[PDB]
Design a protein. Structure first.
Lengths: 296, 289
């Protein structure tokens, strides 16, 4: 059984979430995310609480409930010159940060250094800060999927998701990405994404990233599908953030914004009978199914 | 005696520091500040440690000490959507922040709320963090001159400068601007700048801020003169930061950059016989072996 049936649809249904990550990271990213939601076919996004432009994104989110919004849990900071650290004070979560008090650049260093207790504390703090700013999140997911850097970290993530009664991103391709060879019979109580799509260097370098997105739309199969993008204007701010980091860098994010606000993308959606769904709808369906099961 | 005399110069000598504030505020401001030092006549600057682009500026400062660099002490955050707070944990300095954990927008809210012990801890922590990053500051000054919001805050500021054996920005006009009516007789142990120049909105709104800087250089007289500017490229980042805040806004900051990298401004230094000086030279005259 694939996730589309577990949500009430036929097997053949091409469920899709087009999800913008890293909202709150930069002003250019906030503006491109908002525009892709307003006009594009992007239909969900998640927010990086520890980030310098989180506040602006929060003001947008608390007053624009119609757009499916979640918390982009952040434990790593990958950029050369633009560095951020935890919501909580360094002294409370010392194993999460480098000598400058910023998150590590790599999941490897994080998994080698971080204590599961510090991870639970800081992730809970990020969600609590979002809630106190008036955000009503519909899901939680993970920047660079650092929650998979250790099995204990993923268990903390699952436990936090159940505590807040929120859906979360769990998927087998993302598991293999982070080397987390966890079994599949542990996830009986969870909804697993059948297919996660994201851009790759090998297509970007050959000028074919837009082509990859087009083909991905063209050949989407039945089940729950998730497209992860990072729309942002390729301006001075993003060039400064992504210096020496072409992978998911500023030109890449520009390509994301262009393709997923393009009439080509909408035409491919309608051509293929791909049905968009939000995390909010998924949470409502799971809530009603559990309410119905518990009484009966 | 003006400050040039106390520094060993004749009375008529025109000492000038051309000083970029708000470094570390933004990437556009970091880049305009660096370029105005390397290719313009700017010769000093100071860094906002709490700000989100502090690290980029710190890397530059630690590797390029030939440019006079100080700590722009920060206790207020004036911008609408770009918010920041203290280096220290909120529980340590709770009186310094609004309900979101950020600095208040105006000096007078700071004066209403802040305890001086919290101000002392937070300013000390900004200097200490700069030092940990390998910055070798030559002076300290104050964002929005909020050290002047209360006399006891200014006393903290003076004590901190003496503790680090660094000079600081003190000046009678700055005192008046922030409503501080201190009598000068308590500053015998201090070096006061004779004249502080900064842009004014009434010239900016005529399009004549550049002309204002030209007159400032033309009319400069003997003593210690400080020009305060905020060079930054007027790009999308700065428009996003300075939204609804045209006073020292993004267009204004671009004008700062363009004037102080121009042939006009350099020629004016020569024509007026203006002698540039840094805070480090002053520091070496005051604090001896
Ligand atoms: Mn991310
Ligand atoms: Mn300032």
């Amino acid at each position: 059984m694939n996730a589309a049936q577990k949500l009430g649809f036929t097997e053949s249904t091409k469920l899709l979430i087009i999800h913008a990550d890293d909202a709150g990271l930069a002003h250019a990213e906030n503006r491109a995310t908002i525009q892709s939601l307003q006009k594009g076919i992007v239909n969900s996004y998640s927010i990086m609480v520890p980030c310098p432009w989180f506040y602006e994104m929060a003001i947008f989110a608390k007053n624009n409930n119609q757009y499916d919004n979640g918390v982009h849990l952040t434990l790593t900071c990958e950029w050369e010159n633009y560095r951020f650290g935890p919501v909580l004070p360094i002294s409370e979560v010392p194993s999460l940060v480098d000598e400058n008090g910023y998150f590590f650049k790599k999941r490897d260093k994080l998994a080698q250094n971080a204590k599961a207790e510090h991870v639970e504390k800081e992730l809970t703090a990020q969600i609590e800060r979002a809630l106190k700013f008036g955000i009503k999140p519909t899901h939680i997911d993970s920047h660079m999927y650092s929650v998979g850097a250790k099995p204990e970290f993923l268990n903390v993530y699952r436990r936090i998701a159940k505590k807040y009664k929120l859906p979360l991103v769990l998927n087998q391709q993302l598991f293999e990405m982070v080397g987390l060879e966890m079994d599949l019979s542990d996830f009986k109580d969870e909804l697993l994404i059948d297919n996660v799509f994201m851009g790759e260097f090998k297509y970007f370098e050959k000028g074919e990233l837009a082509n990859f997105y087009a083909t991905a739309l063209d050949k989407m199969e039945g089940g729950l599908n998730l497209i992860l993008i990072h729309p942002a204007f390729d301006d001075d701010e993003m060039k400064g953030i992504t210096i020496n980091h072409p992978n998911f860098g500023s030109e890449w994010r520009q390509i994301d914004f262009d393709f997923f606000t393009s009439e080509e993308a909408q035409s491919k959606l309608k051509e293929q009978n791909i049905q968009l769904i939000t995390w909010d709808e998924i949470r409502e369906k799971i809530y009603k199914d559990l309410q119905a099961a518990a009484l009966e």
